[PDB]
Amino acid sequence: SEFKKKLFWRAVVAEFLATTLFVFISIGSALGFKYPVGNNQTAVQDNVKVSLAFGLSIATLAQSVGHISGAHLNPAVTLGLLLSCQISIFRALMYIIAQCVGAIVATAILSGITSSLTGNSLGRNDLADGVNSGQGLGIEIIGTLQLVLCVLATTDRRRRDLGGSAPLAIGLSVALGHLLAIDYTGCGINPARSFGSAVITHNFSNHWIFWVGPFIGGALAVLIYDFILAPRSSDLTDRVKVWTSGQ
Amino acid sequence: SEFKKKLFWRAVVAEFLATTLFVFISIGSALGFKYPVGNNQTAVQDNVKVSLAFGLSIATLAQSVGHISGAHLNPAVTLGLLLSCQISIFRALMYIIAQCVGAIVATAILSGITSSLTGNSLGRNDLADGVNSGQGLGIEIIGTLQLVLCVLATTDRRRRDLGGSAPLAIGLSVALGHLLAIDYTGCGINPARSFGSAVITHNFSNHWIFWVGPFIGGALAVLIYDFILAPRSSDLTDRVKVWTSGQ
Amino acid sequence: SEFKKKLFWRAVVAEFLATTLFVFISIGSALGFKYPVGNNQTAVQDNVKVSLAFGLSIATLAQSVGHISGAHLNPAVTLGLLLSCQISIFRALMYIIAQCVGAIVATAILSGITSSLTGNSLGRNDLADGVNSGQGLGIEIIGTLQLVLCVLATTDRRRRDLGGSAPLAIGLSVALGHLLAIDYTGCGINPARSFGSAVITHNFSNHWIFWVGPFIGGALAVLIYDFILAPRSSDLTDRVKVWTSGQ
Amino acid sequence: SEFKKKLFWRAVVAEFLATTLFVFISIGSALGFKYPVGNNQTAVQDNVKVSLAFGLSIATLAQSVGHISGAHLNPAVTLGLLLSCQISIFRALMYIIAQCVGAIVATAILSGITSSLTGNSLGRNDLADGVNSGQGLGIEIIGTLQLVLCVLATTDRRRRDLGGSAPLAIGLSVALGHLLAIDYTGCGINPARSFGSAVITHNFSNHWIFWVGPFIGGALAVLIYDFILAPRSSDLTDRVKVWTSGQ
Ligand SMILES: CC(C)CCC[C@@H](C)[C@H]1CC[C@H]2[C@@H]3CC=C4C[C@@H](O)CC[C@]4(C)[C@H]3CC[C@]12C
Ligand SMILES: CC(C)CCC[C@@H](C)[C@H]1CC[C@H]2[C@@H]3CC=C4C[C@@H](O)CC[C@]4(C)[C@H]3CC[C@]12C
Ligand SMILES: CC(C)CCC[C@@H](C)[C@H]1CC[C@H]2[C@@H]3CC=C4C[C@@H](O)CC[C@]4(C)[C@H]3CC[C@]12C
Ligand SMILES: CC(C)CCC[C@@H](C)[C@H]1CC[C@H]2[C@@H]3CC=C4C[C@@H](O)CC[C@]4(C)[C@H]3CC[C@]12C
């Protein structure tokens, strides 16, 4: 069905390119504070700068490819939309693969560009001092929960009171998550974004947190928005059939 | 009437969950500047970061549950909407109870997560040096007045010139209040948000300010918007009947 | 005509109250960096905080009273709308008087609240070191020019491509002007806002700049938008009659 | 055709004036951190302030002259719209000339205003220490690519899901590019903006990067958005005829 449709592959390529741009721009803005290399200054990372960079990248790329691919740009958001029965399993898998490949390519290109930084971590997400696995896991769970909840509520298609720009809302949610989690874990929040940095830097220390926590948060957000707050008056079998049909 | 309706209880649970997420994310972003614990640095709290975190949390959760619960997320805003005769007394009481419980739960969860911080105040609102009870009370009154005025003017339902995103407007109002009041009192502005921190930290010093001042500001905003600027051409008895009817 | 209409006086009172809230909140956020008084720290004023406070105050109060008074909140913007023949002369004079009185009241209330600050200038706009009268005058002219141009283009009523929130656009224009002019002159940009601080602090040094420059910028913006970019296909006599008719 | 139309010349003058205002305000906000001159402090440039100034200037001027000139304000964006066959070659050339002249005039006026700064570079874009020609070229390419992609996707005219303010989206894209590239190259991103500073400061060191990289990024964005993601079902000859017809 969707395997032989041109629009599906265009959406996959759009997700790949937009994830590449998002990862590259956001991590490049995150690593900007270490420049100039020659100037010896005790520069402090600005959380507002990085959070706004992530949020505006999400908003801009969502405005770019919302009508083309739905503007997922996150394996956790894609998995949440799969669990809310909006996209097919094959589409979700292709989106996750494209996002991971794009993040890896973007991180490699940035590491080539930012090769002058000694000991460059390429914005790799890791636990800060004083934060163990459980606390960072909970922070990631809450951030991805609010992000997936915002995504689900924005793309409900049953609401006539919606106003403003949906890409702006998604970007502000991402920026909120970053303002929350940068000081704690660097705000992984995106399994592809952390996975690309882990692959390029050859460091997978505490990498399971940024793949499990976002998925748990997305699943909790789906459970809440679909069975507590705004239930849908449809049979479960029909929504399960969307996984094998994609419509 | 509303006691036996499923939608009312779904709205109450939505208010509870959204208040939990708001309090947790906002206070976690406020306490982020103290990390890493091992690194001994004279870190300075960024007011822009905390104000944007509060505002974007308000905007995101309002976008999430506006069609479900009305997106109050504030005992002062709920009391103002009660005094403007838009919601029933029972609904207002349930919203206040849910917001307080959610704030307490969020503060407890964050204190569990942020247990590594020595002498962690959990973002407890208190008077700064040089500010007495009256000055902080006035600052809180003005901030809650502008917030409740924005909420009332946005949800007027008689205006056809409204544009953009209403959750964005509410979030920007909250961020404005925080930019005003963080340096003075930490911008309590929300009786549930301060109440949860006071309960968890077992400190109620000058806690009456953050419960009286927001209520006074909300009442003043209701009085202004309903009897000076945009009066409603309806009898007072019919609006009083909304308290016992909820319609 | 308009002297005996209730809506005109409600609009005047709305302008007064919104200008009071704007001046109070914005200057209070500007003076926040000097707290705590007891703590001896070399605190540096954050231009982003003050600019965002001014912009969000403008946006929130415009969202509050746009349908009531038109949300001028600036003697320069009011004079520009008078010169673009949208409001009457009496309405413009009443708006200017109300804005000045509200700014004076707000500055007095804040000085009462911020009395603990030694040598508190109450956010009085003055020329910085290295900037003479001409340079600050030009900066104020450009800032008010872009602000009045944005106000005129937003409230054109002939454009069907308008989107988003107009109060948000006006607030972002104000924040842009502040990001431009805070380091130079403190971004007066509003004759009432500077006038209130000058009256309360009993200091009128270089105060003519903040009353002449904004007016010149507004007049230039009106001239441009009405005779170079988007001319109106109406006789000049009919537009002059709006000054004595108000319709 | 368009040479004898008044609206075309009004659009050209609007582009000139808006580019002048954009360059002047943005570079003035960028150079604000060096004041006061007499006060000897180790002031650090705030990237958030400069990025927000650029973005809000773009958004405000786009809101001002979108219905008049299309709000290009960038030779790279104008070239991208020419390559996407939306504007004529003569219109693109006139827009580029007007933008360059306006940027030169704005930089000269600001240098007159900011003459008190010793060794004032007038915000001239140059490679930072540790960044060679290739890395800065790639950063500029990516920033202009995302900017032109956002511009093309926003002004598609085939999308009915668009919401919010398009000038706000363009301004947020510009602010995102600045948050990315300020630490690396100062975020040239606009050939006119860098060209004016280079002409006024009489320094063209590494100036080819800020004229080649933005053009490459715009061309890549046009290629992507027009042949990979959202192809148009029209013959190439008809779109080529727009270059000589302008319709
Ligand atoms: C992503 C695309 C569209 C734009 C960026 C690609 C180009 C400009 C980038 C990507 C990889 C980069 C190279 C990566 C590594 C190095 C080694 C270093 O010692 C000198 C610079 C050099 C040789 C870089 C030059 C610029 C470069 C070729
Ligand atoms: C709110 C939900 C959905 C997510 C967060 C819940 C989980 C991940 C949090 C909440 C309470 C947390 C615990 C609170 C206290 C402590 C004691 C400390 O010495 C080690 C960590 C530990 C044991 C935390 C581990 C993580 C934890 C269990
Ligand atoms: C504007 C309205 C709605 C709210 C603010 C008004 C009230 C709370 C403010 C305005 C003026 C203020 C007073 C101004 C001056 C002083 C003197 C000082 O040594 C102690 C505090 C005291 C006595 C302030 C107390 C609080 C105060 C009374
Ligand atoms: C762009 C327009 C609308 C507003 C700005 C124009 C005016 C106010 C500006 C532009 C050029 C400026 C002059 C440029 C250079 C100098 C030399 C210096 O030693 C004293 C100030 C002085 C004499 C400036 C005074 C103010 C000035 C005349």
Side-chain angles (χ1 to χ4, degrees), chain B residues 11-233 236:
Chain B
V12 170
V13 177
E15 284 284 342
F16 163 80
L17 294 177
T19 309
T20 312
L21 294 179
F22 158 74
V23 169
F24 181 84
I25 296 172
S26 299
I27 305 187
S29 180
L31 297 178
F33 78 106
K34 299 181 179 180
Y35 290 90
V37 185
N39 200 340
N40 44 270
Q41 295 292 337
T42 161
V44 184
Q45 174 71 282
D46 195 0
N47 298 23
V48 179
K49 174 204 303 181
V50 184
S51 301
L52 286 181
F54 271 91
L56 294 191
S57 188
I58 286 295
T60 294
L61 292 158
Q63 183 83 357
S64 300
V65 299
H67 65 293
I68 307 169
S69 60
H72 297 190
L73 303 191
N74 198 322
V77 172
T78 309
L79 181 59
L81 288 178
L82 175 61
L83 292 179
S84 64
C85 296
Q86 301 291 337
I87 58 180
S88 60
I89 300 180
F90 184 78
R91 175 180 293 268
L93 181 61
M94 291 305 299
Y95 281 172
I96 291 179
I97 292 179
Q99 287 159 358
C100 292
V101 170
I104 290 180
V105 169
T107 313
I109 292 179
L110 188 65
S111 63
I113 286 188
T114 59
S115 59
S116 299
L117 299 179
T118 60
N120 185 21
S121 60
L122 275 311
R124 184 184 63 88
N125 301 118
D126 196 4
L127 303 175
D129 298 70
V131 179
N132 50 42
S133 300
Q135 303 159 10
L137 186 72
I139 293 298
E140 292 288 340
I141 282 175
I142 295 299
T144 319
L145 202 159
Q146 65 89 11
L147 176 58
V148 172
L149 181 60
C150 181
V151 171
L152 291 169
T154 313
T155 61
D156 194 15
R157 293 177 295 183
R158 302 182 303 173
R159 303 170 58 182
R160 237 57 58 182
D161 59 330
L162 286 176
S165 181
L168 173 58
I170 305 304
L172 292 187
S173 180
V174 174
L176 163 76
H178 274 78
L179 291 170
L180 167 64
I182 275 179
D183 279 323
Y184 294 88
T185 54
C187 189
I189 226 64
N190 189 305
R193 174 248 180 269
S194 300
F195 181 78
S197 298
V199 166
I200 292 305
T201 57
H202 298 147
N203 198 334
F204 293 90
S205 180
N206 300 121
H207 191 55
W208 62 271
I209 300 176
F210 313 103
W211 272 92
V212 171
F215 285 173
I216 295 184
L220 288 179
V222 169
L223 196 277
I224 290 178
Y225 190 77
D226 293 0
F227 299 92
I228 303 179
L229 310 190
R232 294 157 57 183
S233 300
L236 293 179

Side-chain angles (χ1 to χ4, degrees), chain C residues 47-48 129-131 135 139 142 146 149-150 153 159 162-164 168 172-173 175-176 179-180 183-184 225 228-229 231, chain D residues 10 13-14 24-25 28-29 32-33 35-37 46 49 52-53 56-57 60 63-64 67-68 113-114 116 164-165 168:
Chain C
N47 298 23
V48 179
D129 298 70
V131 179
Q135 303 159 10
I139 293 298
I142 295 299
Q146 65 89 11
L149 181 61
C150 181
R159 303 170 58 182
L162 286 176
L168 173 58
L172 292 187
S173 180
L176 163 76
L179 291 170
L180 167 64
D183 279 323
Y184 294 88
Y225 190 77
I228 303 179
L229 310 190
Chain D
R10 295 187 192 279
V13 177
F24 181 84
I25 296 173
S29 180
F33 78 106
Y35 290 90
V37 185
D46 195 0
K49 174 204 303 181
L52 286 181
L56 294 191
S57 188
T60 294
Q63 183 83 357
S64 300
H67 65 293
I68 307 169
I113 286 188
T114 59
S116 299
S165 181
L168 174 58

Side-chain angles (χ1 to χ4, degrees), chain A residues 46-48 129-131 135 139 142 145-146 149-150 153-154 156 159 161-164 168 172-173 175-176 179-180 183-184 224-225 227-229 231, chain B residues 10 13-14 17 21 24-25 28-29 31-33 35-38 46 48-49 52-53 56-57 60 63-65 67-68 113-116 164-165 168:
Chain A
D46 195 0
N47 298 23
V48 179
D129 298 70
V131 179
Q135 303 159 10
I139 293 299
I142 296 299
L145 202 159
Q146 65 89 11
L149 181 60
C150 181
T154 313
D156 194 15
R159 303 170 58 182
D161 59 330
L162 286 176
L168 173 58
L172 292 187
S173 180
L176 163 76
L179 291 170
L180 167 64
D183 279 323
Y184 294 88
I224 290 178
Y225 190 77
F227 299 92
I228 303 179
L229 310 190
Chain B
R10 295 187 192 279
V13 177
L17 294 177
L21 294 179
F24 181 84
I25 296 172
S29 180
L31 297 178
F33 78 106
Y35 290 90
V37 185
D46 195 0
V48 179
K49 174 204 303 181
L52 286 181
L56 294 191
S57 188
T60 294
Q63 183 83 357
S64 300
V65 299
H67 65 293
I68 307 169
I113 286 188
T114 59
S115 59
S116 299
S165 181
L168 173 58

Side-chain angles (χ1 to χ4, degrees), chain C residues 132-139 141-142 145 216 220, chain D residues 20-21 24 108-116:
Chain C
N132 50 42
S133 300
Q135 303 159 10
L137 186 72
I139 293 298
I141 282 175
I142 295 299
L145 202 159
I216 295 184
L220 288 178
Chain D
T20 312
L21 294 179
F24 181 84
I109 292 179
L110 188 65
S111 63
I113 286 188
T114 59
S115 60
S116 299

